[PDB]
CSV table of C-alpha atoms in Angstrom, one decimal:
chain,number,residue,atom,x,y,z
A,27,UNK,CA,10.6,-31.1,8.1
A,28,UNK,CA,13.1,-32.3,11.4
A,29,UNK,CA,16.6,-33.6,12.1
A,30,UNK,CA,17.7,-35.5,15.2
A,31,UNK,CA,20.3,-32.7,17.1
A,32,UNK,CA,22.5,-35.6,18.4
A,33,UNK,CA,24.7,-33.7,20.9
A,34,UNK,CA,25.2,-30.7,19.2
A,35,UNK,CA,24.3,-26.8,20.5
A,36,UNK,CA,26.7,-27.0,23.4
A,37,UNK,CA,28.9,-24.0,24.4
A,38,UNK,CA,31.0,-22.9,26.7
A,39,UNK,CA,29.4,-21.6,29.9
A,40,UNK,CA,31.7,-18.9,31.2
A,41,UNK,CA,35.2,-17.3,30.1
A,42,UNK,CA,37.1,-19.3,32.8
A,43,UNK,CA,39.7,-21.9,31.7
A,44,UNK,CA,39.2,-25.4,33.3
A,45,UNK,CA,41.3,-28.7,32.3
A,46,UNK,CA,41.0,-32.3,33.2
A,47,UNK,CA,37.8,-31.6,35.2
A,48,UNK,CA,33.8,-32.5,35.1
A,49,UNK,CA,32.0,-29.2,35.7
B,489,UNK,CA,-3.7,4.1,31.4
B,490,UNK,CA,-2.8,5.8,28.6
B,491,UNK,CA,1.0,5.6,27.1
B,492,UNK,CA,3.0,8.8,27.9
B,493,UNK,CA,2.8,11.3,30.4
B,494,UNK,CA,4.9,15.1,31.0
B,495,UNK,CA,6.7,16.2,33.8
B,496,UNK,CA,5.5,19.9,35.2
B,497,UNK,CA,8.9,20.7,35.9
B,498,UNK,CA,8.9,24.5,37.1
B,499,UNK,CA,11.6,26.8,38.8
B,500,UNK,CA,9.1,27.6,41.4
B,501,UNK,CA,9.1,23.8,42.9
B,503,UNK,CA,12.0,20.5,46.5
B,504,UNK,CA,11.0,16.8,45.7
B,505,UNK,CA,8.8,17.9,42.8
B,506,UNK,CA,12.0,19.2,40.9
B,507,UNK,CA,13.5,17.6,38.1
B,508,UNK,CA,16.5,15.0,39.4
B,509,UNK,CA,18.9,14.2,36.6
B,510,UNK,CA,20.2,10.5,37.2
B,511,UNK,CA,23.1,8.6,36.1
B,512,UNK,CA,23.5,4.7,36.6
B,513,UNK,CA,26.8,3.6,36.3
B,514,UNK,CA,26.4,-0.2,36.0
B,515,UNK,CA,29.5,-2.2,36.2
B,516,UNK,CA,30.4,-5.8,33.9
B,517,UNK,CA,32.6,-7.6,36.6
B,518,UNK,CA,33.3,-10.5,34.1
B,519,UNK,CA,36.1,-13.4,33.2
B,520,UNK,CA,36.5,-11.5,29.9
B,521,UNK,CA,39.7,-9.1,29.4
B,522,UNK,CA,39.4,-5.8,31.7
B,523,UNK,CA,38.9,-2.4,29.6
B,524,UNK,CA,37.8,0.0,31.9
B,525,UNK,CA,40.0,0.6,35.0
B,526,UNK,CA,40.8,2.5,37.8
B,527,UNK,CA,44.3,4.6,37.6
B,528,UNK,CA,46.9,2.3,39.0
B,529,UNK,CA,50.4,2.1,37.7
B,530,UNK,CA,51.6,-1.5,36.1
B,531,UNK,CA,54.6,-2.5,37.8
B,532,UNK,CA,57.2,-5.1,36.1
């Protein structure tokens, strides 16, 4: 069987804080 | 080729001697530090 993942499985790429930004 | 070989390390041998090696690998990261050079923290 299968299912759609949608937008699941994103993770923080590095241990740096960033805010109000597109990376 | 065959899976392993043995060194003929004999006391009479100079590049044919056994050399010990240590590689120190440094984990520079955005994680918290835990291995640090001796340097006193100020206020």
